Amino acid sequence: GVEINVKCSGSPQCLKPCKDAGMRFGKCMNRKCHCTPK
């Protein structure tokens, strides 16, 4: 489960939370975020 509960809208809104997380690539969800670690 590499996802984090974050309020996202569109793909780039989740790109921001993952930016500070130091990871790359991600996705979105009705009320959740998706992050992909190396």
Coordinates of all heavy atoms in Angstrom, one line a residue:
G1 N 0.8 -1.2 0.0 CA 0.0 0.0 0.0 C 0.8 1.2 0.0 O 0.9 1.9 1.1
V2 N 1.4 1.7 -1.1 CA 2.0 2.9 -1.1 C 1.0 3.9 -1.7 O 0.9 4.1 -2.9 CB 3.3 3.0 -1.9 CG1 4.5 2.3 -1.2 CG2 3.1 2.3 -3.3
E3 N 0.4 4.5 -0.7 CA -0.6 5.5 -0.8 C -0.6 6.3 0.4 O -0.1 5.8 1.5 CB -2.0 4.9 -1.0 CG -2.3 3.8 -0.1 CD -3.7 3.1 -0.4 OE1 -4.0 3.0 -1.5 OE2 -4.4 2.8 0.6
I4 N -1.0 7.5 0.4 CA -1.1 8.2 1.7 C -2.4 9.0 1.7 O -2.9 9.4 0.6 CB 0.1 9.2 1.8 CG1 0.6 9.7 0.4 CG2 1.2 8.6 2.6 CD1 1.4 8.7 -0.4
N5 N -3.0 9.2 2.9 CA -4.2 9.9 2.8 C -3.9 11.4 2.8 O -3.5 12.0 3.7 CB -5.1 9.6 4.1 CG -4.4 10.0 5.4 OD1 -3.2 10.1 5.5 ND2 -5.3 10.4 6.3
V6 N -4.2 11.9 1.6 CA -4.0 13.3 1.3 C -5.2 13.8 0.4 O -5.7 13.0 -0.4 CB -2.6 13.6 0.7 CG1 -2.6 14.8 -0.3 CG2 -1.6 13.8 1.8
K7 N -5.6 15.1 0.6 CA -6.7 15.6 -0.2 C -6.1 15.9 -1.6 O -5.3 16.9 -1.7 CB -7.4 16.8 0.5 CG -8.9 16.9 0.2 CD -9.7 16.4 1.3 CE -11.2 16.8 1.2 NZ -11.7 17.5 2.4
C8 N -6.6 15.2 -2.6 CA -6.1 15.5 -4.0 C -7.2 15.7 -4.9 O -8.3 15.3 -4.8 CB -5.1 14.3 -4.5 SG -6.0 12.9 -5.3
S9 N -6.8 16.4 -6.0 CA -7.7 16.7 -7.1 C -6.8 16.7 -8.3 O -5.8 17.4 -8.4 CB -8.2 18.1 -6.9 OG -9.7 18.1 -7.0
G10 N -7.2 15.9 -9.3 CA -6.3 15.7 -10.5 C -5.0 15.1 -10.1 O -4.7 15.0 -8.9
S11 N -4.2 14.6 -11.0 CA -2.9 14.0 -10.8 C -1.9 14.9 -10.1 O -1.2 14.5 -9.2 CB -2.4 13.4 -12.1 OG -2.6 14.3 -13.2
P12 N -1.7 16.1 -10.6 CA -0.6 17.0 -10.1 C -0.8 17.4 -8.6 O 0.2 17.8 -8.0 CB -0.7 18.2 -11.0 CG -2.1 18.2 -11.2 CD -2.4 16.8 -11.7
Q13 N -2.0 17.5 -8.1 CA -2.3 17.9 -6.8 C -1.6 16.9 -5.8 O -1.2 17.2 -4.7 CB -3.8 18.0 -6.5 CG -4.4 19.3 -7.1 CD -3.8 20.5 -6.5 OE1 -3.8 20.7 -5.3 NE2 -3.2 21.4 -7.3
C14 N -1.6 15.6 -6.2 CA -0.9 14.5 -5.5 C 0.6 14.6 -5.7 O 1.4 14.1 -4.9 CB -1.5 13.2 -5.8 SG -1.0 11.8 -4.6
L15 N 1.0 15.1 -6.8 CA 2.4 15.3 -7.1 C 3.1 16.1 -6.1 O 4.2 15.9 -5.8 CB 2.6 15.9 -8.5 CG 3.0 14.9 -9.6 CD1 2.8 15.5 -11.0 CD2 4.4 14.4 -9.4
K16 N 2.3 17.1 -5.6 CA 2.9 18.0 -4.6 C 3.2 17.3 -3.2 O 4.3 17.4 -2.7 CB 1.9 19.2 -4.3 CG 2.5 20.6 -4.6 CD 1.8 21.7 -3.9 CE 2.6 23.0 -3.9 NZ 1.8 24.2 -4.0
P17 N 2.2 16.6 -2.6 CA 2.4 15.9 -1.4 C 3.6 14.9 -1.5 O 4.5 14.8 -0.6 CB 1.1 15.2 -1.1 CG 0.3 15.3 -2.3 CD 0.8 16.5 -3.0
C18 N 3.7 14.3 -2.6 CA 4.8 13.3 -2.9 C 6.1 14.1 -3.1 O 7.2 13.5 -2.8 CB 4.5 12.4 -4.1 SG 4.9 10.7 -3.8
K19 N 6.1 15.3 -3.5 CA 7.3 16.1 -3.7 C 8.0 16.3 -2.4 O 9.2 16.1 -2.4 CB 6.9 17.5 -4.3 CG 8.1 18.4 -4.6 CD 7.7 19.8 -5.0 CE 8.9 20.6 -5.6 NZ 9.7 21.2 -4.5
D20 N 7.3 16.7 -1.4 CA 7.9 16.9 -0.1 C 8.3 15.5 0.5 O 9.2 15.4 1.4 CB 7.0 17.6 0.9 CG 7.7 18.3 2.0 OD1 9.0 18.4 1.9 OD2 7.1 18.8 2.9
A21 N 7.7 14.4 0.0 CA 8.0 13.1 0.5 C 9.3 12.5 -0.1 O 9.8 11.5 0.3 CB 6.8 12.1 0.2
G22 N 9.9 13.3 -1.0 CA 11.2 12.8 -1.6 C 11.1 11.6 -2.5 O 12.1 11.0 -2.8
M23 N 9.8 11.3 -3.0 CA 9.7 10.1 -3.9 C 9.3 10.6 -5.3 O 9.3 11.7 -5.6 CB 8.5 9.2 -3.3 CG 9.1 8.1 -2.4 SD 10.0 8.7 -1.0 CE 11.7 8.2 -1.5
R24 N 9.1 9.6 -6.2 CA 8.8 9.9 -7.6 C 7.5 9.2 -8.0 O 7.2 8.1 -7.5 CB 10.0 9.5 -8.5 CG 11.3 10.2 -8.2 CD 12.4 9.9 -9.2 NE 13.7 10.4 -8.9 CZ 14.8 10.2 -9.5 NH1 14.8 9.3 -10.5 NH2 15.9 10.7 -9.1
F25 N 6.8 9.8 -9.0 CA 5.6 9.2 -9.6 C 4.5 9.0 -8.5 O 4.8 8.7 -7.3 CB 5.9 7.9 -10.3 CG 6.9 8.0 -11.5 CD1 8.2 7.9 -11.2 CD2 6.4 8.2 -12.7 CE1 9.1 8.0 -12.3 CE2 7.3 8.3 -13.8 CZ 8.7 8.2 -13.6
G26 N 3.3 9.0 -9.0 CA 2.1 8.8 -8.0 C 0.8 8.8 -8.8 O 0.7 8.7 -10.0
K27 N -0.3 8.8 -8.0 CA -1.7 8.8 -8.5 C -2.7 9.4 -7.6 O -2.3 10.1 -6.6 CB -2.1 7.3 -8.8 CG -2.3 7.0 -10.3 CD -1.3 5.9 -10.8 CE -1.7 5.5 -12.2 NZ -0.7 4.5 -12.8
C28 N -4.0 9.3 -7.8 CA -5.0 9.9 -7.0 C -6.1 8.9 -6.6 O -6.2 7.8 -7.1 CB -5.6 11.1 -7.7 SG -5.0 12.7 -7.0
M29 N -7.1 9.4 -5.8 CA -8.2 8.6 -5.3 C -9.3 9.5 -4.8 O -9.0 10.7 -4.3 CB -7.8 7.6 -4.3 CG -8.2 6.2 -4.6 SD -9.9 5.8 -4.0 CE -10.6 5.1 -5.5
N30 N -10.6 9.1 -4.8 CA -11.7 9.8 -4.4 C -11.4 10.7 -3.1 O -12.0 11.8 -3.0 CB -12.9 8.9 -4.0 CG -14.2 9.6 -3.8 OD1 -14.6 9.8 -2.7 ND2 -14.9 10.0 -4.9
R31 N -10.6 10.2 -2.2 CA -10.2 10.9 -1.0 C -8.8 10.5 -0.5 O -8.5 10.7 0.6 CB -11.2 10.8 0.1 CG -12.6 11.1 -0.4 CD -13.6 11.1 0.8 NE -15.0 11.1 0.4 CZ -16.1 11.3 1.2 NH1 -15.9 11.4 2.5 NH2 -17.3 11.2 0.7
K32 N -8.0 9.8 -1.4 CA -6.7 9.3 -1.0 C -5.6 9.6 -2.1 O -5.9 9.9 -3.3 CB -6.7 7.8 -0.7 CG -7.0 7.5 0.7 CD -7.8 6.2 0.9 CE -8.7 6.2 2.1 NZ -9.9 5.4 2.0
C33 N -4.3 9.5 -1.7 CA -3.2 9.8 -2.6 C -2.5 8.5 -2.9 O -2.5 7.5 -2.2 CB -2.2 10.7 -2.0 SG -2.0 12.3 -2.9
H34 N -1.7 8.5 -4.0 CA -0.9 7.3 -4.4 C 0.6 7.7 -4.7 O 0.8 8.6 -5.5 CB -1.5 6.6 -5.6 CG -1.8 5.2 -5.4 ND1 -2.1 4.3 -6.5 CD2 -2.0 4.4 -4.3 CE1 -2.4 3.1 -6.0 NE2 -2.3 3.2 -4.7
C35 N 1.5 7.1 -3.9 CA 2.9 7.4 -4.1 C 3.7 6.2 -4.5 O 3.4 5.1 -4.0 CB 3.6 8.1 -2.9 SG 3.3 9.9 -2.8
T36 N 4.8 6.3 -5.3 CA 5.6 5.1 -5.8 C 7.1 5.3 -5.4 O 7.7 6.1 -6.1 CB 5.4 4.9 -7.3 OG1 4.0 4.8 -7.6 CG2 6.1 3.5 -7.6
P37 N 7.6 4.6 -4.4 CA 9.0 4.7 -4.0 C 9.9 3.9 -4.9 O 9.5 3.0 -5.6 CB 9.0 4.1 -2.6 CG 7.9 3.1 -2.6 CD 6.8 3.7 -3.5
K38 N 11.2 4.3 -5.0 CA 12.2 3.7 -5.9 C 12.2 2.1 -5.7 O 11.5 1.5 -6.5 CB 13.6 4.2 -5.6 CG 14.7 3.6 -6.5 CD 16.0 3.7 -5.9 CE 17.1 2.8 -6.6 NZ 18.4 2.9 -6.0

